[PDB]
Design an enzyme around this catalytic site. Structure first.
Site, PDB file in Angstrom:
ATOM      1  N   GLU A 110      24.950 -16.452 -43.631  1.00  0.00           N
ATOM      2  CA  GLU A 110      25.082 -17.838 -44.051  1.00  0.00           C
ATOM      3  C   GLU A 110      26.450 -18.598 -44.024  1.00  0.00           C
ATOM      4  OE1 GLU A 110      21.065 -17.814 -46.858  1.00  0.00           O
ATOM      5  OE2 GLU A 110      23.096 -18.207 -47.613  1.00  0.00           O
TER       6      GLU A 110
ATOM      7  N   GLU B 172      15.802 -15.293 -43.205  1.00  0.00           N
ATOM      8  CA  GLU B 172      15.482 -15.327 -44.623  1.00  0.00           C
ATOM      9  C   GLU B 172      14.639 -16.520 -44.954  1.00  0.00           C
ATOM     10  OE1 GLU B 172      18.761 -15.456 -47.444  1.00  0.00           O
ATOM     11  OE2 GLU B 172      19.917 -13.938 -46.398  1.00  0.00           O
TER      12      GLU B 172
HETATM   13  O1  LIG Z   1      22.572 -10.840 -53.017  1.00  0.00           O
HETATM   14  C1  LIG Z   1      22.519 -10.578 -54.412  1.00  0.00           C
HETATM   15  C2  LIG Z   1      21.385 -11.492 -54.851  1.00  0.00           C
HETATM   16  O2  LIG Z   1      20.511 -11.987 -53.849  1.00  0.00           O
HETATM   17  C3  LIG Z   1      21.000 -13.330 -53.921  1.00  0.00           C
HETATM   18  O3  LIG Z   1      20.743 -13.914 -52.653  1.00  0.00           O
HETATM   19  C4  LIG Z   1      21.088 -15.212 -52.171  1.00  0.00           C
HETATM   20  C5  LIG Z   1      21.377 -14.636 -50.810  1.00  0.00           C
HETATM   21  O4  LIG Z   1      22.267 -13.525 -50.770  1.00  0.00           O
HETATM   22  C6  LIG Z   1      21.689 -15.616 -49.709  1.00  0.00           C
HETATM   23  O5  LIG Z   1      21.405 -14.940 -48.498  1.00  0.00           O
HETATM   24  C7  LIG Z   1      20.655 -16.736 -49.859  1.00  0.00           C
HETATM   25  O6  LIG Z   1      21.286 -17.918 -50.327  1.00  0.00           O
HETATM   26  O7  LIG Z   1      19.554 -16.437 -50.734  1.00  0.00           O
HETATM   27  C8  LIG Z   1      19.699 -15.769 -51.977  1.00  0.00           C
HETATM   28  C9  LIG Z   1      19.157 -16.696 -53.054  1.00  0.00           C
HETATM   29  O8  LIG Z   1      18.641 -17.900 -52.488  1.00  0.00           O
HETATM   30  C10 LIG Z   1      20.144 -13.926 -55.047  1.00  0.00           C
HETATM   31  O9  LIG Z   1      20.374 -15.329 -55.161  1.00  0.00           O
HETATM   32  C11 LIG Z   1      20.701 -13.285 -56.306  1.00  0.00           C
HETATM   33  O10 LIG Z   1      20.101 -13.785 -57.508  1.00  0.00           O
HETATM   34  C12 LIG Z   1      20.881 -11.788 -56.271  1.00  0.00           C
HETATM   35  O11 LIG Z   1      22.121 -11.824 -56.980  1.00  0.00           O
HETATM   36  O1  LIG Z   2      21.233 -21.909 -48.408  1.00  0.00           O
HETATM   37  C1  LIG Z   2      21.165 -21.034 -49.545  1.00  0.00           C
HETATM   38  C2  LIG Z   2      21.819 -21.675 -50.780  1.00  0.00           C
HETATM   39  O2  LIG Z   2      21.912 -23.111 -50.704  1.00  0.00           O
HETATM   40  C3  LIG Z   2      22.526 -23.761 -51.831  1.00  0.00           C
HETATM   41  O3  LIG Z   2      22.223 -25.144 -51.698  1.00  0.00           O
HETATM   42  C4  LIG Z   2      23.137 -25.808 -50.823  1.00  0.00           C
HETATM   43  C5  LIG Z   2      22.065 -26.028 -49.758  1.00  0.00           C
HETATM   44  O4  LIG Z   2      21.620 -24.885 -49.045  1.00  0.00           O
HETATM   45  C6  LIG Z   2      22.328 -27.270 -48.917  1.00  0.00           C
HETATM   46  O5  LIG Z   2      21.333 -27.319 -47.881  1.00  0.00           O
HETATM   47  C7  LIG Z   2      21.936 -28.340 -49.933  1.00  0.00           C
HETATM   48  O6  LIG Z   2      22.446 -29.586 -49.463  1.00  0.00           O
HETATM   49  O7  LIG Z   2      22.554 -28.235 -51.232  1.00  0.00           O
HETATM   50  C8  LIG Z   2      23.127 -27.014 -51.738  1.00  0.00           C
HETATM   51  C9  LIG Z   2      24.257 -27.157 -52.767  1.00  0.00           C
HETATM   52  O8  LIG Z   2      25.275 -26.152 -52.665  1.00  0.00           O
HETATM   53  C10 LIG Z   2      22.043 -23.341 -53.226  1.00  0.00           C
HETATM   54  O9  LIG Z   2      23.133 -23.651 -54.104  1.00  0.00           O
HETATM   55  C11 LIG Z   2      22.070 -21.826 -53.236  1.00  0.00           C
HETATM   56  O10 LIG Z   2      22.098 -21.231 -54.541  1.00  0.00           O
HETATM   57  C12 LIG Z   2      21.314 -21.114 -52.112  1.00  0.00           C
HETATM   58  O11 LIG Z   2      22.213 -20.012 -52.082  1.00  0.00           O
END
Ligand SMILES: OC[C@H]1O[C@@H](O[C@H]2[C@H](O)[C@@H](O)[C@H](O)O[C@@H]2CO)[C@H](O)[C@@H](O)[C@@H]1O
Ligand SMILES: OC[C@H]1O[C@@H](O[C@H]2[C@H](O)[C@@H](O)[C@H](O)O[C@@H]2CO)[C@H](O)[C@@H](O)[C@@H]1O
Length: 377
Positions: free
Chosen positions: A168, A309
């Protein structure tokens, strides 16, 4: 050319596996799940405090999956990292092993079971996903050397299909700041400090020198360049690793038989995107959004696209719009032939998504799994 006798290649938009010894060559599909933990402070896939590791692989296979994306952080792939969180009473054969030896043992066994493994360099540190492939502390040359060591070691396991270069790529500031301020990833700025597309050709080429038989999975970034992102109404709302709008004008330069584009896409349990409002046409508005962000790479350009994912709670203790979201995304993937994917997460311990397994790490969420298995036929 291959150390294992197995060679992987992309023909058209299909991944094929070649066995140089029997001469067999068939297309393969990746019905996958993400089993995470090696990228966290545990330094080991999670759930082994409750389950035997081999039993987990067997259960994954029993549900019809044949592939696992395995996230890792730099530390986990170096000799000597102590894993925390394993019930040795249930995992005796793991006593005294370091995290690297455990990953080796799990990948070798997944191979016996016919399970493909995709190595994912998920984090540089072991606490969070960084926006770029390097930090103040860790250089791009270090990132690549970590990959070279990983490839020289795991390239010897037949079932490892390749490398998801960096989990990512994204931004931490807003555009237009984002396209130049240097704190986040970009695509097509023709700026080597932050162009993930230029970076992928670099990291990838280094891996291929050592593992020529591997595939290279390249994710999207979050913002690309202001021309591309502004040319679409939802160009600023793609997910981290989910913006592939820039592939049209700025292909990644890796051989075409080795490159796999790998977007990430999520639902409302992860972020309440503006396009998820029903007054905005949700969910009927999604196909065109998915098509713009990444679908067209396969549908229009003809490249292999493997969703790296996707997942969410599917209404179990989360936003009830996520059931509709997952239903629609699976409908869309099936109709458009996006047959290869990795769900997020085999693990139930994902804060915003839950996973295939329920909280007891043993039973699965039936409705969630029944929707997903439509893709497994
Ligand atoms: O990795 C530890 C964990 O999984 C976290 O994953 C994020 C992830 O790593 C990233 O690839 C993507 O943004 O998705 C997930 C969540 O949306 C998860 O958020 C955690 O709660 C856990 O700590
Ligand atoms: O992509 C995984 C991740 O996204 C986080 O949100 C970003 C998002 O993906 C972007 O498309 C949108 O505009 O807003 C947010 C704000 O940061 C989200 O915070 C995560 O926890 C998840 O890991």
């Amino acid at each position: 050319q291959t150390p294992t006798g197995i060679y992987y290649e992309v023909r058209g938009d299909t991944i094929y596996m070649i066995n140089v010894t029997s001469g067999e060559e068939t297309p393969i599909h990746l019905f996958g799940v993400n089993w995470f933990g090696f990228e966290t402070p545990n330094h080991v896939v999670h759930g082994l405090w409750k389950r035997n590791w081999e039993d987990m692989l067997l259960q994954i296979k029993s549900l019809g999956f044949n592939a696992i994306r395995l996230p890792f952080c730099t530390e986990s792939v170096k000799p000597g990292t102590q894993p925390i969180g394993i019930d040795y009473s249930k995992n005796p054969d793991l006593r005294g092993l370091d995290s690297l030896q455990i990953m080796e043992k799990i990948i070798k066994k997944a191979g016996d079971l016919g399970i493909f493994v995709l190595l994912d360099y998920h984090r540089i540190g072991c606490t969070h996903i960084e926006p770029l492939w390097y930090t103040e502390d860790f250089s791009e040359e270090d990132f690549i050397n970590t990959w070279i060591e990983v490839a020289k070691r795991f390239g010897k396991y037949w079932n490892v299909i390749g490398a998801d270069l960096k989990n990512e790529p994204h931004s931490v500031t807003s555009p237009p700041a984002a396209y130049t301020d240097g704190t986040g990833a970009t695509w097509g700025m023709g700026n080597p400090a932050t162009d993930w597309n230029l970076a992928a050709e670099r990291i990838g080429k280094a891996i291929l020198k050592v593992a020529p038989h591997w595939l290279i999975f390249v994710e999207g970034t979050q913002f690309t360049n202001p021309k591309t992102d502004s040319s679409y109404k939802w160009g600023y709302n793609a997910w981290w690793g989910g913006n592939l709008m820039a592939v049209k004008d700025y292909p990644v330069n890796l051989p075409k038989n080795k490159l796999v584009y790998s977007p990430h896409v999520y639902g409302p349990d992860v972020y309440n995107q503006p396009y998820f409002g029903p007054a905005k046409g949700f969910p009927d508005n999604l196909p065109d959004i998915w098509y713009h962000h990444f679908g067209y790479v396969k549908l229009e350009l003809g490249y292999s696209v493997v969703i790296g994912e996707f997942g969410g709670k599917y209404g179990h203790g989360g936003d009830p719009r996520d059931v509709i979201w997952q239903n629609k995304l699976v409908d869309w993937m099936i109709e458009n032939k996006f047959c290869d994917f990795f769900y997020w997460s085999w693990n139930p311990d994902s804060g915003d998504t839950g996973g295939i397994l329920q909280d007891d790490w043993t039973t699965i969420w039936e409705d969630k799994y029944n929707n997903l298995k439509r893709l497994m036929d």
